[PDB]
Amino acid sequence: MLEVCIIGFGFSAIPLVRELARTQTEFQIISAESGSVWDRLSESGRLDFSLVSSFQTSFYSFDLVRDYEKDYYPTAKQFYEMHERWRSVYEEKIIRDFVTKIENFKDYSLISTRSGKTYEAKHVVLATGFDRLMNTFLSNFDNHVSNKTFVFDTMGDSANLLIAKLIPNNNKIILRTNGFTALDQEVQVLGKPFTLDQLESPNFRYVSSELYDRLMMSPVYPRTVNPAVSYNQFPLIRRDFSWVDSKSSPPNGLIAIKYWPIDQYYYHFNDDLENYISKGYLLNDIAMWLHTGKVILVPSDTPINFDKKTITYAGIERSFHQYVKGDAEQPRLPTILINGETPFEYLYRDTFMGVIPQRLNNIYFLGYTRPFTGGLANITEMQSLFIHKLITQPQFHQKIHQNLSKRITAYNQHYYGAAKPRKHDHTVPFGFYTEDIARLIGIHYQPNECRSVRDLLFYYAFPNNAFKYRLKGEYAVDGVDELIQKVNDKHDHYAQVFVQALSIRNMNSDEAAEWDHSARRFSFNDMRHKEGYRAFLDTYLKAYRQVENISVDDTVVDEEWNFMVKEACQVRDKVAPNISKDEDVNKGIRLILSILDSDISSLPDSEAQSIEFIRRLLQPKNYELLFIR
């Protein structure tokens, strides 16, 4: 009898397959001849973009340990190359077929294929990823079309990449949307580049919900009146968050597009522009697009004729070439039949940690949890660890399964509360999720075990990447020591985010919102760092056009667009003329680095009550997670 069958092999399954190989667990992989989007994009020559996620969070520990030199955004091409290197390694263990049905019994599953070949397997893992409506538009849709109007119903990562591609052909972009959360993927900290995932210091939630909330949420909730911020200049991007019913912020089910803000894009790519473009570094600055009106927000309920092929705004019946409905995201699950008979119904909440469904035996889900920020690698590597422990250690299997139902309920209570299931429940803060799995598995760190300020910096402020939890213990990966050192030396041991936590420990929600936006460039959607980049934008469009062999007359005038652009940018034109963090952080960092190797418990009483606070980081009050305990 087959111990393990892995169904679906592209990206999510690699870390698990590695662990099974390490334990010499008998396993087979079944995966489609036809492959993924990535195979689609590759053969159509459309691996011409870059990830919205840091290298650190997007490639697995056992790669980063070899190839991490600096932070950078890997290209689509490089991401694919990495799937293909690991496919090549495990190809012998892969059967090229398509699974059509799984009949789940008491301690095994019957797997049916399109070939008609049948497979029996004790443990069955699904890693089939998602069908995505939008894949066609990246797959196939023409990036040679010009001067047309697109209407997008939802903003997501795919809409932003497509928009990135449509702007340089004077395509006009209307978002008829119920708001969206966009976040500069890269941020200046005293003028040094940090990917937004470097600045989340998630374990600060253990100090309190309240503190972690003002640490994180002012760029997402509309809490500041600072007129430099995109959600005051353009209030249409504001969202209905009344669905959030949890103390854990940012909440499960919050999604965001991560994007190049043009200043960081400039800093990175100005000196070899066309070369950088043609590798796949595309400017996708939604904030810049709104500033310059190459995109407009219109109200959600703006009238629209799909027959007449027009939308009514600015008292204009505007014709449009295409309405893009936006990215529905469906797990690619084959039919799963319970004890031979009853259809299993997938619902992320009805599953433990996105991984363990309730009425099935020895079936695990790998790749169906979405990280709020950073790459899937964080989620998928930790899930692979969790699934490997469940499959090979019956003690672990039993401990987790005994009370699976109460674990799921306690998880859903903590993270979702009374909220009805939403289609984005699969989305989680990466540094909560990785930490969650690490405490489940037992490869977590103990706050109580920090000795130096340095240890407190590593515990609280070093990002909860998967490889953080592979330094020591059951899932240790050689080279993680040197990776963490490298990463720590390059980022000042993450003292700047640690000092942010110090700085707002005593503020209320509104004080922290104001403080976060007092900076000369606050982290996300700072509209003061846009005008000065109009010239560069034209160089960029010229450069994009020369890489993709495009011709466009920039003198054509769409006076309806301009009336529309003017109608849309009314609040902005009112609010933009009305236009501490850098100082506090600057001092905080000087202080922390001065006591790096200073012993914690030892530190002296009443540089004020901030030491009292640093000392209480050994005994955080919000450490309980009832779906673990």
Ligand X SMILES: N[C@@H](Cc1c[nH]c2ccccc12)C(=O)O
Report the Cα 134 to chain-centroid distance in Å. Answer: 18
Query: In the structure encoding, which two tokens stand for residue 609, read together?
Result: 């009550």
Point out which residues pair with 343 in neighbouring strands: 337
3-state helix, strand, coil in the chain (%, to 5): 45, 15, 40
Angle, in degrees to the nearest 10, between helices 376-392 and 394-402: 110
For residue 323, which of 339, 307, 346, 341 has the smallest C-alpha distance? 307
Which of 83, 132, 426, 493 is the binder for ligand X (CB under 6 A)?
132
User: Which alpha helices (DSSP H) does 105-198 contain, by range?
Assistant: 135-139, 157-166
Q: Residues 579, 228: contact at Cβ < 8 Å? A: yes
Which of 6, 51, 217, 437 is the binder for ligand FAD (CB under 6 A)?
51
Which of 4, 5, 6, 8 is the binder for ligand FAD (CB under 6 A)?
8
* Nearest distance, CB of residue 124 and ligand FAD, angstroms: 12
d(CA 36, CA 32): 9
* Nearest distance, CB of residue 375 and ligand X, angstroms: 5
Give, as ranges, the residues between 16 and 35 that touch ligand FAD (CB under 6 A).
30-32, 34-35
Contact flag: residue 157 with ligand X (CB under 6 A) = yes
Element (H, E) at 210: helix 209-216
Contact flag: residue 53 with ligand X (CB under 6 A) = yes
Q: Residues 124, 362: contact at Cβ < 8 Å? A: yes
Residue whose CB is less far from ligand X, 31 or 284: 284
Residue whose CB is less far from ligand FAD, 165 or 581: 165
Which stretch, 11-19, 193-201, 457-465, 485-493, contacts ligand FAD (CB under 6 A)? 11-19
User: Which alpha helices (DSSP H) does 106-153 contain, by range?
Assistant: 135-139
Q: Contacts with ligand FAD: how many residues (CB under 6 A)?
A: 33
- For residue 556, give the 3-state DSSP assignment: coil
The interface partner of residue 196, options being ligand X, ligand FAD, none and the CB cut-off 5 to 8 Å by kind, is ligand X
For residue 175, which of 310, 290, 56 has the smallest C-alpha distance? 290
Residue whose CB is less far from ligand X, 103 or 197: 197
- For residue 511, give the 3-state DSSP assignment: helix
The interface partner of residue 332, options being ligand X, ligand FAD, none and the CB cut-off 5 to 8 Å by kind, is ligand FAD
Residue whose CB is less far from ligand X, 309 or 422: 422
Point out which residues pair with 189 in neighbouring strands: 192
Which of 384, 500, 503, 525 is the binder for ligand X (CB under 6 A)?
500
d(CA 466, CA 54): 13
Which of 5, 15, 19, 36 is the binder for ligand FAD (CB under 6 A)?
36
Give, as ranges, the residues between 326 and 345 that touch ligand X (CB under 6 A).
327
The interface partner of residue 183, options being ligand X, ligand FAD, none and the CB cut-off 5 to 8 Å by kind, is ligand X
Q: Residues 262, 284: contact at Cβ < 8 Å? A: no
Contact flag: residue 427 with ligand X (CB under 6 A) = no
The interface partner of residue 30, options being ligand X, ligand FAD, none and the CB cut-off 5 to 8 Å by kind, is ligand FAD
User: Which alpha helices (DSSP H) does 331-479 contain, by range?
Assistant: 376-392, 394-402, 404-415, 430-441, 453-460
Q: Residues 35, 155: contact at Cβ < 8 Å? A: no
Which stretch, 3-11, 62-70, 343-351, 370-378, contacts ligand X (CB under 6 A)? 370-378
Which stretch, 3-11, 211-219, 356-364, 510-518, contacts ligand FAD (CB under 6 A)? 3-11
Contact flag: residue 183 with ligand X (CB under 6 A) = yes
Element (H, E) at 498: helix 495-504
b/e code 274-288 from CB counts within 10 Å (16+ = b): bebbebbbbbbbbbb
Which stretch, 196-204, 296-304, 474-482, 612-620, contacts ligand X (CB under 6 A)? 196-204
Contact flag: residue 370 with ligand X (CB under 6 A) = yes
Contact flag: residue 523 with ligand X (CB under 6 A) = yes
* Nearest distance, CB of residue 303 and ligand X, angstroms: 29
The interface partner of residue 549, options being ligand FAD, ligand X, none and the CB cut-off 5 to 8 Å by kind, is none
For residue 289, which of 146, 159, 196, 167 has the smallest C-alpha distance? 167
From residue 292, give the alpha-carbon distance in Å to each of 149, 167, 538. Answer: 16, 11, 12
* Nearest distance, CB of residue 374 and ligand FAD, angstroms: 7
Which of 41, 76, 162, 199 is the binder for ligand X (CB under 6 A)?
199
d(CA 125, CA 384): 10
Contact flag: residue 52 with ligand FAD (CB under 6 A) = yes
d(CA 297, CA 35): 37
Angle, in degrees to the nearest 10, between helices 453-460 and 495-504: 90
Residue whose CB is less far from ligand FAD, 345 or 478: 345
Query: In the structure encoding, which two tokens stand for residue 354, read together?
Result: 């996105």
Give, as ranges, the residues between 202 and 231 that touch ligand X (CB under 6 A).
215-216, 219
Count Cβ atoms below 10 Å from residue 123 Cβ, excluding itself. 25
The interface partner of residue 497, options being ligand X, ligand FAD, none and the CB cut-off 5 to 8 Å by kind, is ligand X
At residue 486, what is the residue type? K
Q: In sequence order, what DSSP letters do the residues of 425-452 get, joined into one string?
A: TTEE-HHHHHHHHHHHHT-PPPGGG--B
Contact flag: residue 54 with ligand FAD (CB under 6 A) = no
Which of 56, 128, 169, 246 is the binder for ligand FAD (CB under 6 A)?
128
Which of 4, 6, 7, 457 is the binder for ligand FAD (CB under 6 A)?
7
* Residue 7-46 contact track with ligand X, rule CB under 6 A, x = bound: ----------------------------------------
The interface partner of residue 199, options being ligand FAD, ligand X, none and the CB cut-off 5 to 8 Å by kind, is ligand X
Which of 98, 320, 344, 613 is the binder for ligand FAD (CB under 6 A)?
98
Q: Residues 427, 255: contact at Cβ < 8 Å? A: yes
DSSP state of 410: H
Residue whose CB is less far from ligand X, 357 or 375: 375
DSSP state of 424: T
Contact flag: residue 530 with ligand X (CB under 6 A) = no
Interface residues toward ligand X, by CB under 6 A: 52-53, 132, 134, 157-158, 183, 196, 199-200, 215-216, 219, 327, 370-371, 373, 375-376, 497, 500, 516, 523
Q: Which residues bind ligand FAD (CB under 6 A)?
A: 7-13, 30-32, 34-38, 51-53, 58, 98-99, 127-129, 132, 135, 138, 158, 332, 334, 367, 375-376
